[PDB]
């Protein structure tokens, strides 16, 4: 957060709270996180005045985070039979849109990102993820 803050000082188009009062929230965010840090580094408290003061939620709360994950084979002890078709029920540039608009490369760990990445200069991420991703044995592709 401090390096992205110095970035924002170097260029005004940083990542804001995206909700309200975007143009000094970062200051109080940093303060609260440092508070929790100090209060939790060396066997500190957990989820009392700290809780009471952080209980205040300014008009800045975002939602809809990815939390990337994939289904599995929950064959516990007795029986779980699957067919060949009609399966039975059991980066940050989206990775979960409403409509499909590209090759829609699939992935196992969290990724679920684009295959060509449709960008110009983010090639660092693409290069680092050219090969199999983190445990990317399920790094597959799917149409539609």
């Amino acid at each position: 957060m401090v390096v992205i803050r110095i970035w924002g000082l170097l260029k005004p188009s940083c990542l804001p709270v995206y909700t309200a009062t975007s143009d000094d929230s970062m200051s109080l965010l940093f303060r609260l996180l440092t508070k929790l840090w100090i209060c939790c580094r060396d066997e500190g408290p957990a989820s009392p005045a700290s809780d009471g003061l952080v209980s205040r939620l300014q008009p800045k709360q975002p939602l809809r985070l990815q939390f990337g994950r994939a289904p599995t084979l929950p064959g516990s002890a007795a029986t779980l039979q699957l067919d060949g078709l009609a399966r039975a029920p059991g980066l940050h540039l989206g990775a979960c849109p409403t409509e499909e608009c590209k090759a829609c490369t699939r992935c196992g760990c969290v990724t679920m990102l684009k295959s060509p990445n449709r960008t110009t200069a983010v090639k660092q991420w693409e290069q680092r993820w050219i090969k199999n991703c983190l445990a990317v044995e399920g790094r597959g592709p799917d149409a539609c």
Partner: protein
């Protein structure tokens, strides 16, 4: 004071405008689901744009109408309801009003739809005629009269804008044995010696007479003679113009008229 309809229309219009703009903004959250051929979503976009234009035009058209409301709202009628809580138990009044209106509308719709009855069969006073005549005579532009020189049977005539009076001599309750004439051609005041019948015309109103006879054999309800004669006189009133002639041109024949269903059209075609 029928502005309530236009105001309900404006209500529906603003509700539809809100719904449309909300749906437009919601649809812009995502692009084409699976196009695979083109970017034809521009079509739906332009459709929503035109719907917005439609909404704006409707708002403008409704702003043009609904000029203004009258002063002194409620017309001092619910002042009792506007009164203090001392005399008001007041909402009960409006409740009963709404209940009565709803019950009336319900009964009307039920009676209307119940016209298709299921009764496979129907089995196990010189004072109503005058009352019915007085009730019917309250209607405007259609003057009636009666002399009854024959006896117990009823004899009466009706007048219209022209002098095309109609001679209807029927029984106590139901209308039958009628005849039509035009422009004093009957002169049934003292014709010959008295109010004569003569069952005749100059070979033009014979068609109108036949139509009226057919109507008499059509509106013959089993009971309620008041409704019968009301339907009869309404049927008669439909000839006050004799100018238009749908389903044809107004040159097909001598005349054009046969409205037993409350709508006239070119005769000799049904």
């Amino acid at each position: 004071s029928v502005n309530l309809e236009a105001f309900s229309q404006a209500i529906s219009a603003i509700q539809a405008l809100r719904s449309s703009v909300s749906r437009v903004f919601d649809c812009l959250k995502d692009g084409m689901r699976n196009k695979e051929t083109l970017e034809g979503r521009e079509k739906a976009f332009i459709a929503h744009f035109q719907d917005n234009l439609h909404s704006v035009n409707r708002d403008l058209n409704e702003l043009e109408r609904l000029s203004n409301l009258v002063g002194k709202p409620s017309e001092n009628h619910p002042l009792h309801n506007s009164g203090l809580l001392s005399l008001d138990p007041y909402s009960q009044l409006l409740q009963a009003y709404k209940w009565s209106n709803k019950l009336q509308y319900h009964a009307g719709l039920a009676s209307g739809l119940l016209n298709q009855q299921s009764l496979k069969r129907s089995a196990n006073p010189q004072y109503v005629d005058d009352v019915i005549s007085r009730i019917d005579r309250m209607f405007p532009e259609m003057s009636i009269h009666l002399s009854r020189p024959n006896g117990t049977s009823a004899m009466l005539l009706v007048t219209l804008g022209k002098v095309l009076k109609v001679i209807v001599v029927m029984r106590s309750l139901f209308i039958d044995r009628t005849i039509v004439k035009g422009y004093n051609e009957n002169v049934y005041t003292e014709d010959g010696k008295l109010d004569i019948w003569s069952k005749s015309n100059y070979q033009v109103f014979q068609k109108v007479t036949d139509h009226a006879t057919t109507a008499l054999l059509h509106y013959q309800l089993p009971q309620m003679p008041d409704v019968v004669v009301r339907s009869f006189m309404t049927w008669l009133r439909s000839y006050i113009k004799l100018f238009q002639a749908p389903c044809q041109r107004c040159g097909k024949f001598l005349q054009d008229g046969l409205p037993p269903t409350w709508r006239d059209f070119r005769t000799l075609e049904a």
